[PDB]
Nanobody, 123 residues
Framework: QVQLVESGGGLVQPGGSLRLSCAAS????????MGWFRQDPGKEREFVAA????????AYADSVKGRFTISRDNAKNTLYLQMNNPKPEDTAVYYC?????????????????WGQGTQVTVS
């Protein structure tokens, strides 16, 4: 009963902020790496950011570095994506995903569970 439920997507102005949340359950959350991917219609899923089980090490797509912050809360079993400087290029459906390992990678097929997605639109 692995469940990953995203929320927080919506319309945001390029001079604003938006925080995505992913409520995880049905597995030992703090044993796995977690990530965010995004997808534009007709295109492949693009890696956005990921972090290891503990949150101590992170990785970001070069195009979002310095604008987004990934974090997790290992008591609440929640994964976050804080968009501090959103841009029009960020418009996409965002998915949270569980890595198959305690760490992470940039390959979508190495994440074994996926959420339902949340649309982000940057005007």
């Amino acid at each position: 009963q692995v469940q990953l439920v995203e929320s927080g997507g919506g319309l945001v102005q390029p001079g604003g902020s938006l925080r995505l949340s992913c409520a995880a359950s049905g597995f030992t959350f703090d044993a796995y790496g977690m990530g965010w991917f995004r997808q534009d219609p007709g295109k492949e899923r693009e890696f956005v950011a990921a972090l290891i089980w503990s949150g101590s090490s992170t990785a970001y797509a070069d195009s979002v570095k310095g604008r987004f912050t990934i974090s997790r809360d290992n008591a609440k079993n929640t994964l976050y994506l804080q968009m501090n400087n959103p841009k029009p290029e960020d418009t996409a459906v965002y998915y949270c995903a569980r890595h198959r390992t305690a760490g992470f990678s940039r390959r979508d097929y190495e994440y074994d569970y996926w959420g339902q997605g949340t649309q982000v639109t940057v005007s």
